[PDB]
RNA sequence: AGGAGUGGAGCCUGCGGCUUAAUUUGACUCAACACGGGAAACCUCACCCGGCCCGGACACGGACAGGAUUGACAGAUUGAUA
RNA sequence: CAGCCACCCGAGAUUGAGCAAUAACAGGUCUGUGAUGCCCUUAGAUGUCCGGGGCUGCACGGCGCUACACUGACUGGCUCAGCGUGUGCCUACCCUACGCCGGCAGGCGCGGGUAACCCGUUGAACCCCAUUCGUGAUGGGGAUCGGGGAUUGCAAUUAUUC
């Protein structure tokens, strides 16, 4: 069970293979440009990372 | 060999222009030829995300833009002066890549 | 799941000789490249650390999905006197000046 | 290997966010104001701006040394390739982060809300 | 009457020749799960095939066998065995003709059906 | 949504039962009038198998299971 | 004043009706409903269902020195590696 | 006067967004959170195992769709008008030109690309419109399942098949 039944097929790619790099949350992630945050964490840190509201 | 390319990049155009002027003036002060500051197109990273942290409310979005300004400058000079000019304590916020082609 | 003792002894020795452990560990997978050579499941280490905190000997900080520990004189003395590992090994938290 | 320019900018931004959050959580008892970062070839220098320097350097320069480790072991820099210093910001009342930390500290000591706000 | 011809292509003539050159002309679909190789992850299907063809020959409903596999097809000897879904809620028993080679609708077993539709009247606006 | 709803199913069914034993003695080849082992049996010349483990005979399945491979001569 | 529109003459989902749950967790609207960046065949809020688990590996009431921690598996082990 | 409506040396005579006050809501979020007050106790615990499957039991008076027609046609017409992504640092999983299997989904092979450097001069309409419109059921569907042969991912059964 620990290592005998699982790990017998490619399943390393699902949504559970990702999580927000700030809060380990798997919902609403941002993959674009690779900063890998959720919506809200990115909104919090956008000023610091370098994204500024101009449009 | 007299083919050297320096790549200047930054999010802030003020620092980019100041460092470009620094490099050009350093090249031209000593007897030496230098090309003009090739001005590459700015890259506008756009990301749009709902303002709200939940599902309630009118659908209002945030359009975060991020401008990357990059220039390329040519140099036909010995590598010693290039290395001296590169280590001139550049202004913060600017990323430089000096390549000896 | 396996519960050994000498693997934890090696983990304790590396913690003493470093101050913090550098080995990403996943509960789901038995081996990770950083986890390897120190084959103890993450769960073991963090449960032992939670028991340690309930007891209390070491300092810690947390940031962006990462732990950052600090081993003070209390932890050095405790690892010294429990496991009877002699002080011929000098801690790495007091290097230089 | 090397990555694209926009990805390097995003990566340095996320690194700065990591660093700022880390030093706000860790240096929450000294009084944390900000950080400056400067780059030269393979030498990256980080400065923590705070109101109290004799308290942030620590005994025999312990903390200031220790911080290097928790940078070096985390950010993935090559060994001995990270340097960091400590200077005191000229003023204190003009930094909103500093005064927010001061108000937070005053409310941490039980001092009443209105008098703490009046003081700040 | 009319027997089974493989969608306008002869089948007895197909079995007239040898067997090694039929994989070069193997039909479309229902071969991917064992397409990794005629190797492991296949013995279960053939075990159930022998089970069914020993308890029930072709042109017959099999005896208590509920396989959920598409039963990768080479010949209409698939009849005599049934693809069935077992949960305690799914139970299909249909005798299907042996015209199924690599093509459409050889499976009448269905794992869903419409649920009880109530009364659609009693007003539509207020 | 609603909870698992897996508590009231499977009536008149019992779990698979595994025997509770204290010692692993009869599991090995022990027919020598003393329970000792002889040198007539060969040892596998490979490194993936533990030295302590020795061949044994079971009137069912096999003395194995982690790798799920029968080790019998068959 | 018009144009394009609408459970009508296709396509994607949010109520017109619900008890092997099948969908409405935010609604006094226009500030619920292609919204939770929520396109769930990844383990989705598991959902409904013959699902091998322990995910007690917080130090101190009983605590053995085997909590009992696999199976492609021939109708007697009636699902593709429960 | 503040201003408004039209124009006689004359490129420019309301572009569109961002920010957006005091005071409020028992508005939403504790199912974003190492942002946190007030909690549960004991067996297939919400975290592994669920072949099958959750709104799909549905009839254009909730976004994105049909012009009963020279304003409209299939390159005899394009030296084109034109946002922005793209590969291995955790991590295999990126964008793809070009040949062959080819008259093609899909497969094979060396190649380029960390990017104004490669995809790429991005196939963002075909304006004379070289099958070619008289009283327009009939180019304004073709009320869609048969066919070279059907997927880098266990599961495609109301679904990336093309």
From Swiss-Prot, chain A:
Q: Which residues carry this modification: Omega-N-methylarginine?
A: 11
Keywords attached to this Swiss-Prot or TrEMBL record, sorted alphabetically, are: Acetylation, Cytoplasm, Diamond-Blackfan anemia, Disease variant, Endoplasmic reticulum, Metal-binding, Methylation, Phosphoprotein, Ribonucleoprotein, Ribosomal protein, Zinc
* Residues that bear Phosphoserine: 8
Keyword match Zinc:
yes
Question: Which parts form a coiled-coil structure per UniProt?
Answer: none
Q: Which GO terms describe its biological process?
A: cytoplasmic translation; translation
Positions binding Zn(2+) in this chain are 20, 23, 38, 41
Which metal ions or organic cofactors does this protein require, according to UniProt? Zn(2+)
Q: Give a Pfam family name.
A: Ribosomal_S14
Q: Does Phosphoprotein count among this protein's keywords?
A: yes
| Subunit description | Component of the 40S small ribosomal subunit.
Q: What does this protein do?
A: Component of the small ribosomal subunit. The ribosome is a large ribonucleoprotein complex responsible for the synthesis of proteins in the cell.
User: What protein name is recorded for this chain?
Assistant: Small ribosomal subunit protein uS14
Gene name per UniProt: RPS29
From Swiss-Prot, chain D:
Superkingdom of source: Eukaryota
- Positions carrying Asymmetric dimethylarginine are 62-63, 65
What changing residue 40 to D does, per the record, is: Phosphomimetic mutant which is detected exclusively in the nucleus
> Where does the KH type-2 domain start and stop, copy by copy?
19-90
Name the consequence of residue 33 to A. Answer: No effect on phosphorylation by PRKCD
Post-translational modification N6-acetyllysine, affected residues = 60
Q: Which cysteines are joined by disulfide bonds?
A: none
- Entry comment on modification after translation: Methylation by PRMT1 is required for import into the nucleolus and for ribosome assembly.
Q: Which family does it belong to?
A: Belongs to the universal ribosomal protein uS3 family.
Q: How does it assemble?
A: Component of the 40S small ribosomal subunit. Identified in a IGF2BP1-dependent mRNP granule complex containing untranslated mRNAs. Interacts with HNRPD. Interacts with PRMT1; the interaction methylates RPS3. Interacts with SUMO1; the interaction sumoylates RPS3. Interacts with UBC9. Interacts with CDK1; the interaction phosphorylates RPS3. Interacts with PRKCD; the interaction phosphorylates RPS3. Interacts with PKB/AKT; the interaction phosphorylates RPS3.
The name under which this protein is listed is Small ribosomal subunit protein uS3
Species of origin: Homo sapiens
Curated annotation (Swiss-Prot), chain E:
Organism domain of life: Eukaryota
InterPro entries given for it?
Ribosomal_uS19, Ribosomal_uS19_CS, Ribosomal_uS19_euk/arc, Ribosomal_uS19_SF
Could you list the residue ranges forming a coiled coil in this record? none
The places in or outside the cell where this protein is found are: Cytoplasm
GO MF terms, alphabetically ordered:
DNA binding; MDM2/MDM4 family protein binding; RNA binding; structural constituent of ribosome; ubiquitin ligase inhibitor activity
One of its GO biological process terms is:
translation
Q: What is the lineage of its organism?
A: Eukaryota, Metazoa, Chordata, Craniata, Vertebrata
UniProt similarity note: Belongs to the universal ribosomal protein uS19 family.
Q: What does this protein do?
A: Component of the small ribosomal subunit. The ribosome is a large ribonucleoprotein complex responsible for the synthesis of proteins in the cell.
Its name, as the record gives it, is Small ribosomal subunit protein uS19
Q: Which organism is it from?
A: Homo sapiens (Human)
Record keywords: Acetylation, Cytoplasm, Isopeptide bond, Ribonucleoprotein, Ribosomal protein, Ubl conjugation
Q: Where is this cross-link: Glycyl lysine isopeptide (Lys-Gly) (interchain with G-Cter in SUMO2)?
A: 97
Q: Which GO terms describe its cellular component?
A: cytoplasm; cytosol; cytosolic ribosome; cytosolic small ribosomal subunit; focal adhesion; membrane; nucleoplasm; nucleus
Q: How does it assemble?
A: Component of the small ribosomal subunit.
From Swiss-Prot, chain F:
Q: Which residues form a coiled coil?
A: none
What range of the parent protein does this fragment cover? 78 to 151 of 156
User: Gene encoding this polypeptide?
Assistant: RPS27A
Q: Which residues carry this modification: N6-acetyllysine?
A: 27, 36
Q: Which organism is it from?
A: Homo sapiens
Cysteine pairings via disulfide bonds: none
This protein is called what?
Answer: Small ribosomal subunit protein eS31
Instruction: Outline the segment boundaries, as ranges, of region: Disordered.
Output: 1-18
Q: Where are the annotated C4-type zinc-finger regions?
A: 44-67
Q: Which residue numbers mark the cross-link Glycyl lysine isopeptide (Lys-Gly) (interchain with G-Cter in ubiquitin) in this sequence?
A: 30, 36
Question: Localized where?
Answer: Cytoplasm; Nucleus, Nucleolus
Function (record text): Component of the 40S subunit of the ribosome. Part of the small subunit (SSU) processome, first precursor of the small eukaryotic ribosomal subunit. During the assembly of the SSU processome in the nucleolus, many ribosome biogenesis factors, an RNA chaperone and ribosomal proteins associate with the nascent pre-rRNA and work in concert to generate RNA folding, modifications, rearrangements and cleavage as well as targeted degradation of pre-ribosomal RNA by the RNA exosome.
PTM summary: Monoubiquitinated at Lys-30 and Lys-36 by RNF25 in response to ribosome collisions (ribosome stalling): ubiquitination promotes subsequent activation of RNF14, leading to EEF1A1 ubiquitination and degradation and rescue of stalled ribosomes. Deubiquitination at Lys-36 by USP16 is required for maturation of the 40S ribosomal complex.
Quaternary structure note: Part of the 40S ribosomal subunit. Part of the small subunit (SSU) processome, composed of more than 70 proteins and the RNA chaperone small nucleolar RNA (snoRNA) U3.
Q: Which domain of life is it from?
A: Eukaryota
